[PDB]
Design a protein around this ligand. Structure first.
Ligand code: MG
Ligand code: MG
Ligand code: MG
Ligand code: MG
Lengths: 381, 381
């Protein structure tokens, strides 16, 4: 009854892609694989992070983010201030399984034309179906969120209600960078079992790979603890700074689970992360609620907003080379609060125009965006 | 047996006025401390007070005697650059106040009289007032409460190294030096939270309701208040950093008065000042599982021998606060050679300092590893 969970709705019936969009998406993905990924925390990876605005920052720069204001993005890219998730891959394996397509993760990708706009999608579906043949999901991005207190809505506007707007802008920027058309917005709630006993207790009788209370997959997770830190540290720095070893596939039998845990222990002497991280605990998880919503790219609507992003990045490049004016800017934001974007960026645009006498740039955020007004309205009460 | 059997009266003072000299000096010092204004912790004016001094948690790092941070991060922090915890502190206080029969007060950040760049903020100081009336011998005794989750609490071995981790010992030393007191109780607590109110009332000790029958330590309730600015945020920092808490009035409450306090607190929450900025979130039920207390006395001479190093470090901080260019190129220099190489980093810093102060007689810091750095390196490798 396990094979009944593999949906074949996206299996492509032909050997070669006939429709044009499938061909272009596959070709673009093949171009993406040719783009070199880089090792973490070293090499050009710094020259990739500092040279662009990540997709999660674009919602803030648009003045359409409900928690951060543009000045924090401006100061972050200049190294100043004021004073992912651990289950993501599990979601990837769920989507790859139930939709019968191979999903690959790729590092940070910068847009070809506007290099200062970059994004890192949680995964892109390849052309290969799992049960053989091609798949219709080729080139479809994956964006997976794990809210803890927020309730997942399935009705209402796609831009506002089903998908939170800042996440919607993140997906739009991701689709713009990778030059793809579709992205699946997957929202998952995960509970962890107290013990292995409770894990085997909640097993669905007819199907061992599911939970009997949520009718969704369950599995294991290996936690690798940082060494420098932790050892005897005392807070939540340890949680964020853990890395994880993930199971090979879902719907594992209990024996295969324990055998894989042990083999992972023995071979961790050769695991690179275990040499730099210590095997901590073994977590047992189950999916409790999974929603998926297709999001398509509006390219013209984003290109209309590219000029604003260009002006913002020009401000970043400006204050990166003038440390004195950056200090006096920090004092100016110290005076009037950081949510007052109109005055802050009027000051910033003056500072910019003072040394660039041929810039037609006008101050940004002079009027609240419609989303800013909506958020402030939601604040009352 | 009533809960009053747990109240130790060993520190009850029999007279009305303090006769002995040390009690008089400690009480007078406490009265002097009360006149110095403290700010609303965690918010602005406090955070501005911290930037003008080296806090007690930084001294272990500056001494090159901290196993997790190196002095360069303290230097860069004070110049505005980069690159089961506090929530139960009050609960710990209420435990210490109960079993030791003394009133404990919080006093915020205090700066040292002579060296104003050395400041400390104790988790609490015992007043002269005993709980059952009269004076107490614990007047002026500092309180420092720690909540390890993975660290094992040791009961034997060195006080400076084994019972109290060395960095914590230096924190307590700085607190005793700043507050000009003589003794501090180092309290270490482990707390687990109940799944349900049912488990709370079931785990009540029969003869004494205020204790747990499985841990033989106090249990109680706690009200969690979530920030309003953040509603649906998917960060764990969301409220857990920005949350405020409503605490019970006393320990050893009966179940009925517990429920009455929860209900009355919920209903009256609208007249609360916090009601306009915070929402009642969850109600947590806690019990203590392990509590250790260890007396630590001040070694004033050993700290004053180390004050010159702190003065030189703070002079470096004041130096780079005025030279943004040299701070930028310093940060790039720390990008080159790693942050753990304090000898090279602060040789560079001493060069940069002597270039504009050609007669300050300062020699490079951290040219040789401290013995504690050696021990930590042995444990790390
Ligand atoms: Mg991103
Ligand atoms: Mg993501
Ligand atoms: Mg402190
Ligand atoms: Mg503390």
């Amino acid at each position: 009854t396990y094979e009944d969970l593999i949906s074949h709705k996206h299996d492509y019936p032909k050997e070669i892609y006939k429709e044009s969009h499938y061909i272009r998406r596959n070709t673009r993905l093949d171009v993406i694989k040719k783009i070199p990924q880089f090792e973490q925390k070293s090499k050009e990876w710094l020259k990739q992070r500092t040279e662009s605005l990540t997709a999660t920052a674009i919602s803030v720069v648009f003045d359409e983010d409900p928690y951060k204001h543009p000045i924090v993005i401006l100061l972050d890219k200049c190294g100043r201030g004021l004073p992912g998730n651990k289950y993501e891959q599990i979601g990837t394996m769920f989507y790859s399984f139930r939709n019968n397509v191979e999903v690959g993760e790729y590092g940070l990708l910068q847009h070809s034309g506007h290099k200062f706009i970059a994004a890192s999608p949680d995964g892109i579906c390849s052309k290969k179906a799992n049960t053989g043949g091609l798949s219709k999901l080729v080139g479809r991005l994956l964006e997976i969120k794990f809210p803890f207190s927020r309730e997942i809505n399935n009705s209402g506007d796609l831009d506002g209600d089903i998908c939170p707007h800042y996440y919607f802008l993140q997906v739009q920027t991701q689709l713009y960078v990778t030059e793809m058309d579709e992205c699946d917005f997957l929202q998952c709630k995960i509970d962890e079992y107290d013990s292995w006993e409770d894990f085997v207790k909640d097993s669905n009788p007819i199907v061992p790979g599911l939970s009997k209370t949520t009718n969704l997959e369950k599995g294991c997770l290996i936690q690798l603890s940082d060494k420098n830190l932790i050892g005897s540290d005392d807070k939540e720095k340890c949680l964020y700074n853990s890395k994880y070893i993930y199971p090979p596939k879902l719907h594992m039998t209990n024996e295969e689970i324990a055998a894989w845990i042990s083999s992972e222990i023995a071979n961790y002497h050769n695991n690179d992360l275990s040499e730099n991280y210590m095997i901590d605990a073994v977590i047992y998880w189950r999916l409790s609620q999974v929603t998926c919503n297709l999001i398509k790219l509006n390219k013209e609507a984003f290109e209309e907003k590219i000029p604003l992003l260009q002006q913002f990045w020009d401000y970043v490049l400006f204050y990166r080379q003038h440390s004195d004016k950056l200090d006096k800017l920090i004092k100016f934001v110290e005076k009037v609060k950081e949510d007052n974007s109109a005055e802050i960026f009027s000051y910033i645009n003056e500072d910019f125009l003072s040394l660039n006498k041929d810039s037609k740039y006008e101050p940004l955020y002079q009027e609240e965006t419609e989303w800013r007004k909506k958020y402030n309205q939601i604040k009352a009460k």
